[PDB]
């Protein structure tokens, strides 16, 4: 029971027994918490509870100290001092924002705003409390017992009565029962096991709630500005390919951490791997939340970096197939590519954290606890999609609230900004530049004249809650008959059930806007499906239309975003 106060560091025996994370609170601050919240259970070696036999008084404001023991108003001895008085809770070694984080349900956007505007220790307290709240919530869902097996990619499921039905999509990974992690999509429902097994009827699944470890390290280390490149050793022979980023690689060696905002196709992967060619002796650990993001850095490194000093770190609990061309689990190779939850405890000359909009403050803190670096580089875009906040249902989370790094990029600006998009046709670049980049993103490519927009609301049907718009897929089908060059297009939409219907009807490869992030395709066919807050989200709209290298067809539902699209309009 010896610890430091999560609000003002003053050492204390006190801990809130009512907080899901039981934080150490100092006498002055513990009082300010118990007197202003429903939280009244205070904990030392012994809890502050009435010592009188069979007495259930556990509220610290209704208790007193009778010698060395604690009693309520009904049991206290004549000579007894209140545990709560004079702005303090009695203990050893004798805030509004802490209260809100400690008592919120994490379903309002204002909870996440506070978790990002508060002091650094309160950001970790919020990131711990939120992750633990999300984990306990995973226990509320029902068990799915297999009723029948149709084939190798088809089954019929039976659900637990009295417990809600969890959303069936790639965002929810089940744990088969100990027959490996599994995933589900749409009475014929498709089954996707991260481990191959002959689907057993009766054998059930559950969403494995992984234990929330405490956070020790800050989301961001304190900034340090240096007058010379510290601990890194540059070249003068630096390939003309990376010539554009040498002033920015020098900025990287002259600061503890640095932020890079890179709109779609501005050269983030290229910048990250080119930092390794600029400091060729420096040991670089490349990290991201997703395997897809780490694999995209592995693919760019395979082209420029020597394959022998590269290692792709794979956790023993191999979930889904990833990058195979590097020596696996060699923690000591000069270039280590690894996800945040799999990071080994090591040090580096540079740490590169990619797709920073997908990081939570919990992930930012873990990276600072597992890796001790000379320089930390955060690459990403606050105009792209953030991590899914499964408890959040009320309000929209703005980019300045995704994490501490995004909060910085949106307020003080990024340290470095990649201003030229080399991927998209100018129609797409001009549209997103105006929409999310204050007209600072410039098009390298010319207008392709293959970017079309069609205003068609169609009919919205719902597979539980994920939406379908068959008339919009019907418009795509009609378009494909007249534009067969578009046969090579990737179908993109904000809903997996729309994608499921369009895969059966169009036969095009499917992708949600969220799963398309980081990827590029020559042709993209996008159906907005609905005009909800989800399908109208500007960061999702930005990601959807910036996937295309050559042409895009947008079948829109929202008049607003249709009007903003600087594409050739089509009739039908
Ligand atoms: Zn304190
Ligand atoms: Zn509390
Ligand atoms: Zn009592």
Curated annotation (Swiss-Prot):
Swiss-Prot/TrEMBL LRR repeat ranges: 208-228
Reaction catalysis annotation: ATP + H2O = ADP + phosphate + H(+)
Positions of Zn(2+) 12 binding: 16, 19, 33, 39
Domain called (+)RNA virus helicase ATP-binding: residue spans: 237-418
Coiled coil ranges: none
Mutagenesis or variant effect for residue 399 to S: In strain: Mu/B.1.621
Function field: Plays a role in viral RNA synthesis. Multi-functional protein with a zinc-binding domain in N-terminus displaying RNA and DNA duplex-unwinding activities with 5' to 3' polarity. Activity of helicase is dependent on magnesium. Binds to host TBK1 and inhibits TBK1 phosphorylation; the interaction with TBK1 decreases IRF3 phosphorylation, which leads to reduced IFN-beta production.
Name of protein: Helicase nsp13
Full-length numbering of the shown residues: 5325 to 5916 of 7096
């Amino acid at each position: 029971a010896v610890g430091a106060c999560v609000l003002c560091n003053s050492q204390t025996s006190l801990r809130c027994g009512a907080c899901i994370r039981r934080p150490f609170l100092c006498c002055k601050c513990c009082y300010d918490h118990v007197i202003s919240t429903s939280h009244k259970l205070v904990l030392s070696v012994n809890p502050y509870v009435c010592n009188a036999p069979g007495c259930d008084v556990t509220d610290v404001t209704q208790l007193y100290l009778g010698g060395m023991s604690y009693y309520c108003k009904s049991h206290k001895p004549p000579i007894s001092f209140p545990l709560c008085a004079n702005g303090q809770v009695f203990g050893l070694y004798k805030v509004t924002d802490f209260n809100a984080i400690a008592t919120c349900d994490w379903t309002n956007a204002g909870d996440y705003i506070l978790a990002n505007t508060c002091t650094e220790r309160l950001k970790l307290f919020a990131a711990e409390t939120l992750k633990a709240t999300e984990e306990t919530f995973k226990l509320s869902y029902g068990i799915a017992t297999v009723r029948e097996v149709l084939s190798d990619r088809e089954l019929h499921l039976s659900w637990e009565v009295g417990k809600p039905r969890p959303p069936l999509n790639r965002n929810y990974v089940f744990t088969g029962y100990q027959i490996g992690e599994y995933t589900f999509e749409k009475d014929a429902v498709v089954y996707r096991g991260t481990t191959t097994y002959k689907l057993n009827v009766g054998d059930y699944f559950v969403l494995t709630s992984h234990t929330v470890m405490p956070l020790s390290a800050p989301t961001l280390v304190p900034q340090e500005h240096y007058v010379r490149i510290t601990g890194l050793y540059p070249t003068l022979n630096i390939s003309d390919e990376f010539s554009s980023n040498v002033a920015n690689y020098q900025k990287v060696g002259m600061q503890k951490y640095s932020t890079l905002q890179g709109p779609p196709g501005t050269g983030k992967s290229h910048f990250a791997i080119g930092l390794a060619l600029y400091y060729p002796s420096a040991r670089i650990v490349y990290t991201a939340c997703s395997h897809a993001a780490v694999d995209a850095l592995c693919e760019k490194a395979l082209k420029y970096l020597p394959i022998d000093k590269c290692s792709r770190i794979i956790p023993a609990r191999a979930r889904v197939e990833c990058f195979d061309k590097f020596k696996v689990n060699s923690t000591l190779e000069q270039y280590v590519f690894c996800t945040v939850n799999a990071l080994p405890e090591t040090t580096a000359d540079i740490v590169v954290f990619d797709e920073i909009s997908m990081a939570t403050n919990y992930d930012l803190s873990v990276v600072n606890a597992r890796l001790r670096a000379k320089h930390y580089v955060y690459i990403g875009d606050p105009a792209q999609l953030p991590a899914p906040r499964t408890l959040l249902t009320k309000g929209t989370l703005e980019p300045e609230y995704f994490n501490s790094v995004c909060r910085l990029m949106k307020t003080i600006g990024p340290d470095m900004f990649l201003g030229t998009c080399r991927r998209c046709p100018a129609e797409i670049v001009d549209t997103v530049s105006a929409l999310v980049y204050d007209n600072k993103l410039k098009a390298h490519k010319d207008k392709s004249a293959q970017c079309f927009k069609m205003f068609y609301k169609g009919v919205i049907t719902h597979d539980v809650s994920s939406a379908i718009n068959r008339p919009q897929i019907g418009v795509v089908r009609e378009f494909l008959t007249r534009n067969p060059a578009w046969r090579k297009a990737v179908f993109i939409s904000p809903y997996n059930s729309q994608n499921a219907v369009a895969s059966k009807i169009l036969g095009l490869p499917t992708q949600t806007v969220d799963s398309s992030q980081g990827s590029e395709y020559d042709y993209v066919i996008f159906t907005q499906t609905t005009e909800t807050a989800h399908s109208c989200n500007v960061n999702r709209f930005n990601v959807a239309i910036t996937r295309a290298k050559v042409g895009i067809l947008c079948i829109m539902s929202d008049r607003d975003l249709y009007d903003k699209l600087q594409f050739t309009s089509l009739e039908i």
